[PDB]
Amino acid sequence: LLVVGPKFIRANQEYTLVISNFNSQLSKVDLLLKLELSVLNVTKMVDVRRNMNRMINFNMPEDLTAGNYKITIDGQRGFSFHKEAELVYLSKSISGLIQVDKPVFKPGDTVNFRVIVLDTELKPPARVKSVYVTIRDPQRNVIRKWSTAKLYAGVFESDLQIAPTPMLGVWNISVEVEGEELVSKTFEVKEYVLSTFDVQVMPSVIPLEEHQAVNLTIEANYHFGKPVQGVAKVELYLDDDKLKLKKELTVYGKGQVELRFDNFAMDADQQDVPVKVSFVEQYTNRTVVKQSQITVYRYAYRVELIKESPQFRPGLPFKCALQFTHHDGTPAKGISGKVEVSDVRFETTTTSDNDGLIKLELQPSEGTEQLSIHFNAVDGFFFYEDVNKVETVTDAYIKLELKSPIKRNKLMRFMVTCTERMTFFVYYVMSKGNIIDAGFMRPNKQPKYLLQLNATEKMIPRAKILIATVAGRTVVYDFADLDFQELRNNFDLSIDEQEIKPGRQIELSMSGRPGAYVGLAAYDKALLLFNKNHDLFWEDIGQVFDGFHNEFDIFHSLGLFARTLDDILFDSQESWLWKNVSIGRSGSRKLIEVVPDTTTSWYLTGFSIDPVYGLGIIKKPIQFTTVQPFYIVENLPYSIKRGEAVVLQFTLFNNLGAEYIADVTLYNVANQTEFVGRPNTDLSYTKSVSVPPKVGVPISFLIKARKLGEMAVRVKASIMLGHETDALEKVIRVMPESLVQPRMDTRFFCFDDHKNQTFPINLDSTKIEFRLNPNLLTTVIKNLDHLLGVPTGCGEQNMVKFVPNILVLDYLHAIGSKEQHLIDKATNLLRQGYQNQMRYRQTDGSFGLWETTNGSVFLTAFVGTSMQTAVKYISDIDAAMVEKALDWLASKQHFSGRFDKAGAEYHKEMQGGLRNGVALTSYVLMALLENDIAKAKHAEVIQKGMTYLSNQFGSINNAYDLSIATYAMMLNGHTMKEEALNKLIDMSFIDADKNERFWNTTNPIETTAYALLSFVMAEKYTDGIPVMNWLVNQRYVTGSFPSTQDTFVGLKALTKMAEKISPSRNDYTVQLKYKKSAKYFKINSEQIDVENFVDIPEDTKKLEINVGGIGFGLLEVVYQFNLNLVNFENRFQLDLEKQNTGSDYELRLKVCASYIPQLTDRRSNMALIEVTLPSGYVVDRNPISEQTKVNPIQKTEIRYGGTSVVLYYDNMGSERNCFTLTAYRRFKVALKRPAYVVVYDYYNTNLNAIKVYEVDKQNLCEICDEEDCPAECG
Ligand SMILES: *[C@@H]1O[C@H](CO)[C@@H](O[C@@H]2O[C@H](CO)[C@@H](O)[C@H](O)[C@H]2NC(C)=O)[C@H](O)[C@H]1NC(C)=O
Ligand SMILES: *[C@@H]1O[C@H](CO)[C@@H](O)[C@H](O)[C@H]1NC(C)=O
Ligand SMILES: *[C@@H]1O[C@H](CO)[C@@H](O)[C@H](O)[C@H]1NC(C)=O
Ligand SMILES: *[C@@H]1O[C@H](CO)[C@@H](O)[C@H](O)[C@H]1NC(C)=O
Ligand SMILES: *[C@@H]1O[C@H](CO)[C@@H](O)[C@H](O)[C@H]1NC(C)=O
Ligand SMILES: [Cl-]
Ligand code: NA
Ligand code: NA
């Protein structure tokens, strides 16, 4: 008995079971058929006759839910038989796929993806017109959501930009249809950091015994891509002879080495020889060890027998072929020898055809017992394999062969061939996961039988056919696709049969259905190497084209289950060609594209979906390699300093078939570069070196930098009189001795009626520039992504990537600007900033100072409300997430209305509880009040809070606290607001000479800014002008303020004030008059913001600015001080000591820092340490060791190409916070200027210390190679 039914069930689909009775003992068999959280109880008493099928239908109930289903076939009466099967329930009529242009991404990287949705017929579902897509980071924060992602030919495409410092780990793309997940897919975001490098060892040519040697390519590369310089020790072990061959060589990224054997004579035709390669990186001495077995072969080819079937049939033809291949897998053509099969007196002396085959058609007579297939070549090579005759018990097969085309409403003709003379065999036909048709066929004791079937409508456009018989006591089968060619999407893609060359172009030719969508994608096997463990897309889409994925079960894949008698067995860089295109009118489209300039192997893929004909795929992915004939690779330090002698090291690579002299030319761009030993007027320096094939060859230039700023490193290389070239345009940052702290003096004017005014300015080597700006946000908008000259790696500081964008948009909307480029810029960075800020969200829904830590009341109020506000401008903000944060915040409020700090105290004046919590309480209320939605949904917190302030008001004596309380009261319309502001005013200071008013607290920018906001609420515009005069003049060179909260409150205050006092239109002339000459500026456009009017005064003493007209403007002077680098401390003690490493290339620097407590002030605010390195040094993977545990480093930030390390602390007291930093000398630099370490209080940078340190001095005479060693040496 053979029972076959589908394994999958659906709501309405008729479920057809088939029972085939081939038992010749009885003449009928009686069966019971159960079919069952049991939401089904359908039974069927049923009768199957001898030598016949019986097809039993089952109407599925429309109201099926997910559950556990079974089907049970029981043999009633005198026939024992119990079989059972699990039926998997399907809720969907559709399936989904996600394609992603890469498996792994880096930080500043765009993810591109497509969502493909197809119905049972593999076409776009007509019912489904849009899907619900959501992407979330490794901690499940929603980062982008498409609620109605429209399909086009079943496909939805889009992208996500990963942030500059994003959340690392596994992201999840998730697709939903009608609130039910259809498909999800992960991708990874990793950091290249992994300064560890990979080593590879492979033979450069297939080793043959006659060579008496092995030639090896050794290759060492960092994961990002650059070559590694080191010494490779190569060992090769011959254990039969207790021998060992050694060789050492310096490898610059890639090298070759030949190892010669003495008397190598293998016993067999092959022999594995183990090899070990120890690769020691140059200065670090970081060792990586790589091993492999390397086969030596006697012959350049190998043979295997390829048979039509495993055994041959006694009296029938037997087709097979001897397949010749080289040991790299490729076909081996033209190999000659002599085949003979003596059992048949067969013989042929030929050579392997163009596919490496020698095809054979042997003819065993019925007497023939076996076929001994020998092959012998005159080189001594021989290959023998025996084929045995079919034994029914273990070897019997049945095969199916389509004999006619498969057209709709025509017959389908098949030749069923079996090894046995058949009494019966069965067929089944499936389409859309149900059995359409079946039959019990009865050959009259025949090995062949011609099966004919009418193609029905239910088989369109995709069906399959399975045949099966019983031979011996095994069920043998075979199957075939019924692809109705006239109803299918006949998609195909191809490349011209040429060598595809870097930089040149290739012509993609494709064909299919006119309307059809086409999606193309190419991946380099490199990317597919590091992660092939997870699901490959091409496997996914290929599988959906067919069936459903221990050993290959044909029934599982066909969507079925089979069962039978107990004693019966069954037999057995950037992305490229991510284009979408359409096939057009003539049924073909040619896309033409430029091959990227890189050496790699590609995997090009292409699918196609027609709205009517559905999914179409290419057989296997297209493959080809692109090989740069000649390139050059740089290895430069991130920075150097004026006057230092640096060796710029490069490495050359030649992939042609011969050794060629390369000419490398380093250019002196804009008088930036001195070539040591050559006059200052030279514009270039050319050296030459020979470059063998596939061997890295170094080349270097000794130079000094002449100008601060960015030095262009401009190189050109060529090899055969310029017939092969490569070029590089890179950057080294030339820096000053001491950390330049720029100062900006600014004066603003605001003329309503036509006014003339003259501003004198007294100045005080130090380069200086004047600037005219029509707007507070001009330079801010210009510097939106890099506003501060201070690290910002903590949760509060990171809001500089978020809040300033809001202030910009708040203002651009308030004045109704139509300068779209700006709205676009602020909007985009705001989106990037959301993603970035989520790093600091905590499990409880709050926000903390670090990626993982206790949440902060201050930061949760700051971030939560700020994000609520951001909903105006971007839609990617998770509302539920904001709700959670503000709920966490609200629960922290005391019965009295008071808020206390939570987590670390990083900002004393705000979080401190020395003055009844007035600052923090006022801030939380202020933040909520500033946003109408939050104000509404937490009215209770505001009420209790304002009551608290009302009670504490008499004791509020600190201007910082009072400025926040007052501004909250103004926002709230509290009865005490007028009284609070008056009190605040009473505490104010003035500078009468400068027409300034301000507040002298330890955070005077915040305080004065908060005060100005209240002035603005109270419409005190004239008395506010002196306040603005002061604030405007504390601005950092970018237009922000030098710190974070200073910036957020400061810019809010300045822009708010500006909105109210600024004239309707600008129309003014600024005459800048220095030394003697006079520069002129005119501003007649109000709206305009994007405006340069920079200008460089020389080493000047005084300066005169005459403004005339009407409008608003900022008159700025920027000083670039260059103070001498000198030890200094104020309220911090900082001590450095170099530790003896025993290597000139290793620097172990012990840093110890501590706050100097004084009176009530026992600990600092958040404190950073920055360590800067001497030129040419770089930090290791984890450069910090021997940390003190008392007060741990909360964050380590490595930047500027391992040149700078920033270490963050919650705060310091008089405990000695120590650590040891390890760095290696990666680049040859002489006359090195000293480096330094700084520690400072973040929110009060006046408190800081700096200590200089020097390193052992490399001498110019060691650095240079002989040619350019100057005339002061020997
Ligand atoms: C690449 O595929 C996109 C679909 O993602 C095609 O874009 C659409 O074009 C149709 C009209 O042809 C419009 O209805 C849609 O508005 C477009 N979608 C979007 C979101 O742009 C695009 O035509 C394809 N490109 C090519 C060259 O074939
Ligand atoms: C990704 O999301 C899907 C649902 O969209 C979920 O089933 C799966 O568990 C998630 N992956 C991870 C890494 O948790
Ligand atoms: C092995 O490499 C050496 C050095 O280039 C070369 O001379 C030799 O031809 C190579 N061996 C073979 C068999 O190609
Ligand atoms: C502001 O206060 C600081 C610290 O108390 C003090 O050094 C400074 O003189 C004050 N400035 C003015 C103008 O009062
Ligand atoms: C690396 O090894 C070289 C040579 O053995 C030595 O000169 C140098 O000091 C070593 N560097 C380190 C980091 O130990
Ligand atoms: Cl807090
Ligand atoms: Na001042
Ligand atoms: Na030096």
Author numbering: 22 to 57, 64 to 576, 581 to 603, 630 to 821, 830 to 1339
Excerpt from the paper describing this PDB structure:
The refractory allele, TEP1*R1, has been expressed in vitro and utilized in structural and functional studies. The TEP1*R1 catalytic loop contains a sequence of five residues including Lys 966 and Glu 970 (966KAGAE970). TEP1*S1 Glu 966 adopts a different conformation than Lys 966 in TEP1*R1, directed into a pocket occupied by a Cl− ion in TEP1*R1, within hydrogen bonding distance of Ser 921 Oγ and Phe 923 N (the same conformation observed for Glu 1098 in complement factor C3). In contrast Ser 921 is within hydrogen bonding distance of TEP1*R1 Tyr 971 but not TEP1*S1 Trp 971. The S1108R substitution does not cause any perturbation in the interface however, the Arg side chain adopts a conformation within hydrogen bonding distance of the carbonyl oxygen of Tyr 1307 instead of a water molecule as seen in TEP1*R1. The remaining 23 polymorphisms are generally localized in short loops between the TED α-helices and introduce no significant alteration to the structure, with the possible exception of four (F960S, E1005V, K1009V, T1012N) on the face of helix α7 and adjacent to the post-α5 turn that form a crystal contact within the TEP1*R1 structure. TEP1*R1cut also forms a complex with LRIM1/APL1C that presumably contains an active thioester by a spontaneous conformational change with a half-life of 6.5 days at 20°C. Residues in the new TEP1*R1 and TEP1*S1 models are numbered according to the complete peptide chain (including signal peptide) for comparison with other reports.
Anopheles gambiae thioester-containing protein 1 (TEP1) is a complement-like protein that plays a central role in the opsonization of gram-negative bacteria in the hemolymph. TEP1 is composed of a series of eight macroglobulin (MG) domains, the β-sheet CUB domain and α-helical thioester domain (TED).
